[model samples]
Target chain A: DSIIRFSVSLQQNLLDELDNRIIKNGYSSRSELVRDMIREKLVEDEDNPNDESKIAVLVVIYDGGQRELNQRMIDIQHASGTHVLCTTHIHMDEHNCLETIILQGNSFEIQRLQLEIGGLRGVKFAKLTKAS
Target chain B: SIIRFSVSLQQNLLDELDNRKNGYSSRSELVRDMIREKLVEDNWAEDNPNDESKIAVLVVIYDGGQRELNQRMIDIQHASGTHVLCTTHIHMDEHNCLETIILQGNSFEIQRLQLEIGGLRGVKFAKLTKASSFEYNE
Candidate 1:
């Protein structure tokens, strides 16, 4: 692994806050904390449409009573060419259900799938977290 | 005088909205709220660096095992002088916790808080949904 050293200038209060968080989170040094932050940002910035393949997790919350809506969701997932690696469903309450779908495919396809599912009638909240 | 208009949306999309049960009396009310939200988003996006006050929502998912992280979050908020209007916490699992914090303050301060909290160890996801206070004139 290659190591790069750099200095960042931040306001006094901001720097103090950072120090508090570093210690609170049990990081041994400021460099380690900053390195992890940089890695996290890089992962966030790496989402590109041109990427050949990507993995994503789509979390959806919806009304569990809508059986037709659930069926339609299944149908749409089947129609999409993207691979649905796995899915986990949880019953949040009597009326609501939360489902997480793990998907793998081209970036565009995964996004499209998320949009389609998110735009469905019973879905209350749908968000895609890209892992690739 | 009140004006009414019709909107056409796909059945599935409409169904999704109805499922939200967001306390709107009707679909029209829901649409109005959505439009207002969009306007707030656009206004925030235009970027008024000089503006000292704004509204935003920060969503964070973190490991609950880090006992000090929560106290640190509150301390950061207290130190920033940002007005935290509300906060909702949901336990995603035994180890994972998700919290949404609604805050109003200088845009820069809000962003700083988000970054500092998000950068902490055990935080898996941190996202900010920016919005601005809305004023409606008749």
Candidate 2:
């Protein structure tokens, strides 16, 4: 019956709420709270039958009214490349919008698509989230 | 380029790691993910009085018609000492509004901000997914 041990890099103030939760919930250790959450946590699994293909989610906020931005998005969707799993468009306001696209492809093509689409002049923020 | 190191843990978790590896490519990645997760956990559980800053994304879902929620949410953000990196909005359907707010700050302020907005009247759900630069580097 060996106890589990691991090294964690440490770092921490304002509402005192986090510690208060510990007090209210009667937790002896702060890490235990996270452990319980982990025990209960869609996480991910990554073994698949593919020729080095990976799926990723790319989120971008862009200028909605910019000329050709809309059509370019459509072009990227129809192009021969990563298979799109549908992209959701969010009209944020009068001028800006956000789009989240989930796609699957090999490394070279996926990296290319991320850079190309992200480089578009209208894009305000571009981020890709993937699990390996 | 991961700095090679050895992480020693209990057989209890080692066994759990085996059961959890449903389809992972290898055990290395499995442990790598665990490290990433713990790093994030550490970020939120920070107790440093002299903390510098960390990053997190707060996803908030709210009802549009719930009596001036937009202003209250805005007010909460402004009052929050944390720096707002970016805020993206998605108008799902007619009434449901989803906003993803990216922020950077000490853990205390960020946690407080999340609770304030989450406790608001119109806000239905709020979850702060914390992360640091460490997760992607390794």
Candidate 3:
């Protein structure tokens, strides 16, 4: 592995806060924390620029009792050209359930599908986190 | 125009949301605001990168006593030609401070400013939330 050494100037108080947070978060060192932060930004930066195919995770919370809603969601996913990588569903309770759908396709297509599912009658929350 | 609708949520989830009610008069208002916020984010994301003007918020956590760092940040912002509309600073401790700067200008300029500030020494955390002017009618 290639590693580069560099120096950063910061206020003592900010450095102290960073140290506290590092310990609290169980980070081994400042370098480790800084590396992870850069990696995170890089991931966001890698998102498809031209609305081309990409990967995303769509999470939705909805009422499970809406029997027809499940079929509608599946149908929409199947019809969209975007590949449905997989889906994990968790029954929150007798009335509610949470579903996470992993998908790959044009960013716009994925978002359109997400809006369709999120606007359903029983869905209470819908959020998408993009990963490429 | 007014639209009324009903939403069903798990009791636990509803309770959790209620706990986070922060100034929202009611659940309906909270939900509406959240939807609008999401729309704003979506609009920002879908905006043409080649466009010259945009809005963004830059958040930075840095050392408070680093006087040079403060002037450096100001110089970059000024040179970028981005309008610094407002800035909110909070003293985190004797040596650390957090500043949130709201700016409007060419998207490229905003991004350049973000990179410059984030690359500066002594800045522990730097993030930019891209947004655009959104008119809400209700």
Candidate 4:
């Protein structure tokens, strides 16, 4: 990789606003902050590929009391050939339950699992994170 | 025997130690513990390769309004080879949703599959948790 320095021109108001925001955010320098933002966007874009070799973690929350919903969720996971790894269940009060389900596999299969569970009526949260 | 040595560190990280009042009273103590911790982590990974039949949970948040994403997610699951242990989803708002999926597989393979789904356009958040099975006392 090569490192290069470049200059850019911007409106006076925009430049001032950017500087103020960076100062408020405790940024060491405008260049460093901008570099991080660009890197983050790059990581996000890198994760966008549909390749099978990528690793990811998915988390979803739903109503534990919903009739048949619990069973259906288990059924879908069982259908996937990937291992369950491990799970943590929390009784988030009387009616709601939060489960953190960790899994690994190709992108296509994981997406399918998310779609099935997310569509259920009482589900409230579904989040996934990919490793760097 | 008594001896002395010199080490280097960043001011920010050193300041953190002073602020936290860590046990060592000096950077050397913290550095030793940090080294040990890194060694321990490497040991665990070596002992538990993804092939050892492990479990992992995947978490994801997405836009509920994207009907296509919802449909596509399910279609992918139906086509996967991993076992579906269970799943729970929460509706954070009218437009956003959260879900957790439990699965079993080779650790590496499962992780790759998760990255693919999370990378999808509609997904906003995705996290993973690994599990360790307890050895039998008997």
TM-score for each model: 0.38, 0.49, 0.38, 0.39
Query: Comparing 1 and 2 by DockQ, which wins?
Result: 2
- Write candidate 3's Cα lDDT for A9-76 as tens digits: 32233344445556866877765654444333223432223456665556666778877998988888
Q: For candidate 2, lDDT tens digit of each residue in A31-65?
A: 56434434444243223324576655566667887
RMSD in angstroms, all models? Answer: 19.0, 11.5, 23.3, 19.7
Each prediction's Cα lDDT score?
A: 0.61, 0.59, 0.61, 0.54
User: Can you write out model 1's per-residue Cα lDDT over B1-138, one digit (the tens) per residue?
Assistant: 223333433444445545532223345444433433333444555556777667556767888888898888888889976788666665556877766666777777888888888888888877766644322110
**What DockQ, between 0 and 1, does each candidate earn?**
0.02, 0.11, 0.01, 0.04
Report the TM-score of candidate 1, chain B only.
0.62
DockQ of 3: 0.01
lDDT string for model 1 (A1-132, tens) is: 233243344323334444555686687665565444433332333223754775556666677887798888888888877887667676545776756666668766776676678657666545666544
How are the candidates ranked when ordered by DockQ, highest leading? 2, 4, 1, 3
Name the better of 1 and 2 by TM-score.
2
Per-residue lDDT of model 3, residues B32-113, tens digit only: 4343344444455555756655755676778889879999999998899888766766565677676667676776778789
Candidate 1, residue B106: the lDDT equals: 78
- Please give, for residues A3-93, the per-residue lDDT of candidate 4 as tens digits: 4443333223323434554676687665554444433322332124354543445555567777898788889889965456556686544
Query: In model 3, which regions exceed 4 Å deviation?
Result: A1-132, B6-26, B75-81, B86-93, B98-100, B107-112, B124-131, B136-138
Q: After superposition, how far is residue A43 of candidate 2 from its true place, in Å?
A: 13
| Count of clashes in candidate 2 | 3
TM value for model 3: 0.38
